[PDB]
């Protein structure tokens, strides 16, 4: 099941990356 | 049933990959 | 009934493959 | 009734095969 | 009534065969 | 009434045979 | 009323025979 | 009224006979 | 009124006879 | 599971960054 | 887990900054 | 009593429907 | 009483329908 | 009373329909 | 009793439906 | 008893549906 | 018993649905 | 027993749903 | 036993849902 | 056993939900 | 075992919720 | 084990809540 | 372990509450 | 450890309460 | 007082209803 | 006062209804 | 007093209902 | 005041209705 | 006193109901 | 004021209706 | 102060209630 | 301040209620 | 601020209510 | 910001309501 | 962004409402 | 993106509404 | 993609609406 | 693919609408 | 395939619509 | 197959429409 | 088979339409 | 069989249409 | 049988149509 | 009002007399 | 905002004046 | 926004003036 | 956006001016 | 998008100017 | 797509200019 | 597809130019 | 199919050019 | 079938060329 | 049948060639 938890970690990292990009571009705004 | 769990892991990895690509391209945007 | 579960595993693997191909091509996009 | 379940297994295998072929050709696309 | 169930099994086998042929020819496509 | 059920079994067998022939000829196609 | 049910059985047998002949000739086709 | 039901039985037997003859001749076809 | 019902029985018997003769001659055909 | 906690830390850092950018721009307002 | 607590500290600092900016602008009002 | 004669009329109309459909058959041939 | 004679009229009209359909048959031949 | 004579008229019209249909028969022959 | 004769009428109308559909078949050929 | 004859009528109407659908098939070809 | 014949009618209607859907398929091609 | 035949009817209706959906697929292409 | 066949019917309806959704996909493209 | 097949049906319905949501995605784009 | 497959179904429904919410996002943009 | 997969489902539903709220944000802007 | 993943789910739901309240803020402005 | 993450969740819910009350303030103005 | 006159009107309408029903009777004869 | 005059109008309409029903009676004779 | 006149109106309407039902009887004969 | 004149108009229309029904009576004789 | 007259009206309505049900009986025959 | 004149018009139309019905009467004689 | 204005609104609504009840009186007369 | 403006709106709606009730009075006269 | 503008809208709608009620008055006269 | 524009739209619709009610006034005169 | 454009559309529709109401005014004069 | 284009279409339709209302004005003059 | 093309079609239809309304203007002058 | 071609057809019909409206303009001048 | 050919036919009809509208233009000049 | 030939016929009729519209153009010049 | 021959007839009529339209062209020149 | 011969007749009439249109062409030149 | 002979007559008339059109051709040259 | 009560008492007595006469007649029948 | 309250005072004074004049003239009545 | 409130004050003053003039002239009436 | 609010202020001032002029002239009336 | 808002401001200013001119001339009236 | 928005801005500016010119000339009127 | 959007931009620019020229000449008028 | 889209782009460019030339010459007018 | 699509592309290119030449010559006009 | 489609392709190519030549010569014009 550890694979499922790794997948969750990946999903959350990706979401954090989306949020960070949105933050940076909104700062550019 | 472990095969089902492996399939779930695969699905989530693929979704994470989609999200990562979308994040990178939105950063390129 | 294990055959049914194997069939489910196959279906999910195929769906994951579709998603992975779509992800790769969207990255190419 | 086990024959019915075998038939279901066959149907799902065939559907999985259709999906796999569609996935491969979409990757070729 | 078991004859009815056998008939159902036959019908589903035939449908699975149709689907398998369609899958193979679509792969040939 | 069992005669009615036998007739139903016959009908379904015949339909399955039609479907099997159509499947085989579509495979020949 | 059992005569009516016997008549129904006869009708369905005849229809099944028609279908079987059509199936065989379509296989010959 | 049983005479009416007997008449109905006769009608259906005759129709079944017509259908059987048509089936046999279509098989001869 | 039973006479009316007897007349109906007669009519249906006659119609069945017509149909039976037509069936036999079509079989002769 | 520590990976999950790291992901949470990342998410919260990103949210804090969004909030800080919004604060700075509202100060600019 | 200390990372989570640091993230909380960051969030609260950002909120305090928002509030301070709102206070200053309301004083300007 | 009127309802009884009404039912008789319905019987006769049904027989008329039989004959009319048979005529349509014979014309179609 | 009028309803009774009305029902009689309906009977006679039904018989007329019988005869008319029979005429249409004979014409079609 | 008028309704009663109306019903009588309907009876007679129905008989007229009988005769007219019979005439149409005889003409068709 | 009227209900019984009504049911008989329904039987006959159903047989008429059979014949009419068969005619439509034969026309379609 | 009327319910029994009603059920018979339903059987016959169902057979009519079978034949009519088969006709529609043959027309579509 | 009426319920049993009702169930038979349902079976036949279901078979009719099968045939009608198959016709719709063939038309769509 | 009626419940058993009802269940059979449900099976057949489900198969009809399969075929109808497949037809809708083929039309959409 | 009826419950078992009911469950089978549910399986088949679910497969129908799969196919119908796939059709809706293909139409949307 | 019926519960097991019920659970299988639930699995398949869930997969259908996946596909339907994906279709809605693709339409929204 | 049924509970295990039920849990799997819940997992899949949750993934469906993810996809549906993502679609709603994309529509809102 | 079922409880573990249930917990996983809860995790995924929570992530869905995150995404849905974010969508509501973006719509409100 | 299930309790740990439950706690994680609670964390994520709390973050969702944060985002939803922020959305409500932005709407109110 | 679960208690610790529970406490973290409580912290985050409290922050959510802060934001929600602030929104209610801003609406009231 | 308007209420009283309304009541009188209702009385008269009721008497009219009496006469109308009497006409119905007389016609039915 | 308009209410009173409306009530008078209703009285008169009721009397007219009486006369009309009386005409119905007289015609029916 | 209006209540009393209303009650009288109800009496008369009831008598009218009696006559109307009697007409129903007489017609049914 | 317009309401009062409307009421007068209604009175007159009612009287006209009286006369018209009287004409109906007289013609019926 | 209005209550008493209302009760009388109810008596009469009940008698009317008796007659109406009797008509139902007589028609059913 | 237009309402008042409309009411006058309605009065006059009502009087015209009176005269027209009177003409109907006189012709009927 | 908003409370005071709300109280004034309540006063006015109460006056409206008075006036409307007086209207209902005048209509009832 | 929005509360104050809402209170003003309530005042005006109450005045409207007064005026409309006065209208209903004047109509009723 | 949106709340303030909504309050203004409510003020204006209330004025419209006043004006429309005055219209209804003037019509009623 | 969309909320603000929606509020503006509401303002304008309210003005339209005012103007339309004034139209209805002027027509009523 | 689509929300913003929808808001603009609403603004324009509101202006159209204003203009159309002004038209209706001018016609009414 | 389709949503954005739909929004543009709505903008244009709103402009058309403006223009058509202006037409109706000019006609009314 | 079909959705995108449909959106384009809507754009063009909206332009047509604009142009036609302008035509109606020019005619009205 | 048929959907795509239908979309193209819609595009062309929209262009035709544009052109026809321009024709109507030019005629109106 | 018939669907595809129908789509082609629609394309051609749309082109015809374009051309005919252009004709109508040229005539109008 | 008849459907396919009908589709071909539609193609040809569409071409005829094109050609006829071109004729109408050339005449209009 | 008659359907197929009818389809052929339609093909030929369409060709005739083409040819006749070409004639009309050539005349128009 | 009459249907088949009618279809042949239609074929021949279509050929005649072709030939006559060719005649009209040749005349027009 | 008369139908068959009528069909033959139609065949011959169609041939006559062919021949006459050929005559008209030859005259036109 | 007691006069009204005596009147309806007379009415019911007369109706009872009619019923008794019809009863004695049907007894003589 | 005190100006709004003064306006309300004016409105209520004017309404009171209307009511006082109406009272005076109704006293004169 | 105070300008909007001043505008509302103006509107209400004007409406009060209209009402005062109407009151004065109704007193003159 | 303040420009929009100024425009609204202008619109309301203009409407107030229209109302004031109408009030003045109605006073002159 | 600010350009769109400026355009709206312009439109509303122009409409206000139209209204002001109409008010001025109606004052001149 | 910003080009489309600029085009819309242009259209609205032009419409505002038309309205301003119409306002100016109506002032000259 | 961006070419289509550029074409739309061109069309709207041209329409805006037409409108601007019409506005200029109407100002010259 | 991209060729079709390019063709549409060409058509729209040409139409825009026609419109631009017409605008230029109407400016020259 | 791609040949058909290429033919359509050719047709549309040719039509675009016609339109471009017409635009050029109308510019020369 | 592919031969028929090739023939259609040829026809459309030829028509496109005619149109291209006509466009070229109209450019020469």
Author numbering:
A (entry chain tA), B (entry chain jA), C (entry chain ZA), D (entry chain PA), E (entry chain FA), F (entry chain 5), ...: 1101 to 1129
L (entry chain a), M (entry chain f), N (entry chain p), O (entry chain k), P (entry chain u), Q (entry chain 4), ...: 1001 to 1029
Y (entry chain 6), Z (entry chain w), AA (entry chain GA), AB (entry chain m), AC (entry chain QA), AD (entry chain c): 2001 to 2029
AE (entry chain O), AF (entry chain M), AG (entry chain K), AH (entry chain I), AI (entry chain G), AJ (entry chain E), ...: 1 to 29
AR (entry chain HA): 2101 to 2129
AS (entry chain XA), AT (entry chain NA), AU (entry chain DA), AV (entry chain 3), AW (entry chain t), AX (entry chain j), ...: 101 to 129
Copy text verbatim from the article accompanying this structure deposition.
Here we report seven high-resolution cryo-EM structures of filamentous peptide nanotubes based on a cross-α supramolecular architecture that provide insight into the designability of helical peptide filaments. A structural interaction is identified based on an appropriately placed pair of arginine residues (RxxxR) within the corresponding peptide sequences. This local interaction motif, designated as an arginine clasp, is robust within the context of these cross-α assemblies and can guide the coalescence of helical protofilaments into structurally defined cross-α nanotubes. In contrast to most structurally characterized filaments based on synthetic α-helical coiled-coils, the chain axes of the helical protomers are oriented in a plane nearly perpendicular to the long axis of the assembly.
Arginines were placed in an i,i + 3 (RxxR) arrangement within a heptad repeat located proximal to the N-terminus. The sequence at the axial interface was conserved in order to maintain the cross-α stacking interactions within a protofilament. The resultant peptide was designated as 29-20-2 using the same (x-y-z) nomenclature described above, with the value of z equal to 2 for the RxxR motif. However, the observed widths of the filaments were significantly larger, circa 12 nm, than the corresponding values for peptides in the (x-y-3) series. A 3.8-Å resolution helical reconstruction from the corresponding cryo-EM images afforded an atomic model for the 29-20-2 filament. Unexpectedly, the filament formed a double-walled cross-α nanotube that was similar in structure to that of the Form II filament and a structurally related mutant. Remarkably, the arginine residues in RxxR motif were not involved in the lateral interactions between cross-α helical protofilaments. Instead, cohesive interactions were mediated through hydrogen-bonding between the N- and C-terminal glutamine residues from helices on laterally adjacent protofilaments, as in the Form II-related structures. The relatively minor substitution of an RxxR motif for an RxxxR motifs drove the lateral association down an alternative pathway that resulted in formation of a double-walled nanotube in which lateral interactions occurred between terminal glutamine residues.
